[PDB]
Amino acid sequence: SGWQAPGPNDVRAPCPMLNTLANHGFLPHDGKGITVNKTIDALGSALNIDANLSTLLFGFAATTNPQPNATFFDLDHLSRHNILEHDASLSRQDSYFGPADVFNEAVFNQTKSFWTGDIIDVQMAANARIVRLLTSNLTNPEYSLSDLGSAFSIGESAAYIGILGDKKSATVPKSWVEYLFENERLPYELGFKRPNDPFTTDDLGDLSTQIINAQHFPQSPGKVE
């Protein structure tokens, strides 16, 4: 009850969380025809994300619809390389190697190795993201990261801490994050509960700044902020 894997005509994204919300039915289970109202309602219902942040994210999502000026998106639209989808994902391979939409065990094994305790803090999240950037740059001859892709990468690490975890301590249990990625199901059984405080654009901004502040390069190699 409450969760179903995708079937052959369902579409999924490179986003572990939208995929999770489609699997649960917060978003349409076939991943299609997502409007601004469905986004607001789904992200508010499942996660207590506020309307303004839901609206901002929807605005970006709509840009990936191949129809111009679209009022909806489908989850597979989000997989279009170098619009929102970017290299040096935590759990997906770069498009250069293979499809950048589905979970990739090799890549996620790398990310997990930088999550060094049972509680993920801002330092571990920043560290895991950095090694993905450097690893893609040195292994992918087509490696790219746009100013928008960089902002998204930083915000994705901020998101799993603040939306799945405790945005005030800026910590999240590692098992919860691993479960979300590996199952695209919410880790309710491991203790996750929908937060009572809405998650805002300013919350995401605050955690994003913390991520950048936890980066200690002697000299930044390329697009790291």
Ligand X SMILES: *[C@@H]1O[C@H](CO)[C@@H](O)[C@H](O)[C@H]1NC(C)=O
Binding-site entries for Mg(2+) = 85-86, 89
CB of 55 or CB of 82, closer to Mg ion: 82
Q: Is the dihedral of CA 186, 188, 194, 199 positive or negative?
A: negative
In the complex, least distance from residue 119 CB atom to Mg ion, rounded to whole angstroms: 26
Give the C-alpha separation, 186 to 3, whole Å.
Answer: 9
Residues making up the annotated binding site for heme b are: 15, 86, 89-91
Return the structure tokens found at 184: 């695209």
Give the C-alpha separation, 14 to 49, whole Å.
Answer: 20
Question: Of these, 100, 128, 145, 224, which contacts Mg ion (CB under 5 A)?
Answer: 100
In the complex, least distance from residue 218 CB atom to ligand HEM, rounded to whole angstroms: 26
The answer to whether 153 contacts ligand X (rule: CB under 6 A) is no
The answer to whether 164 contacts ligand HEM (rule: CB under 6 A) is yes
SS3 83: coil
Return the structure tokens found at 183: 């199952």
Give the C-alpha separation, 173 to 183, whole Å.
Answer: 16
The answer to whether 223 contacts ligand X (rule: CB under 6 A) is yes
In the complex, least distance from residue 78 CB atom to ligand HEM, rounded to whole angstroms: 4
Selected range binding ligand X among 137-145, 161-169, 186-194, 195-203, rule: CB under 6 A: 137-145
Is 114 within 8 Å of 70 (Cβ atoms)?
Answer: no
- Fill in the DSSP letter of residue 85: B
In the complex, least distance from residue 136 CB atom to Mg ion, rounded to whole angstroms: 9
DSSP string, 145-177: --HHHHHHHHHHHHHHHHHHSBTTTTEEEHHHH
Site size toward ligand HEM (CB under 6 A) is 27
Question: Of these, 11, 12, 16, 74, which contacts ligand HEM (CB under 6 A)?
Answer: 16
CB of 15 or CB of 163, closer to Mg ion: 15
SS3 206: helix
Question: Of these, 43, 145, 170, 214, which contacts ligand X (CB under 6 A)?
Answer: 145
In the complex, least distance from residue 219 CB atom to ligand X, rounded to whole angstroms: 10
SS3 89: coil
CB of 10 or CB of 149, closer to ligand HEM: 149
CB of 10 or CB of 100, closer to ligand HEM: 100
Q: Show the beta-strand stretches assigned E in 59-161.
A: 119-121
Name the residues that contact ligand X, by CB under 6 A. Answer: 105-106, 109, 137, 143-145, 221-223
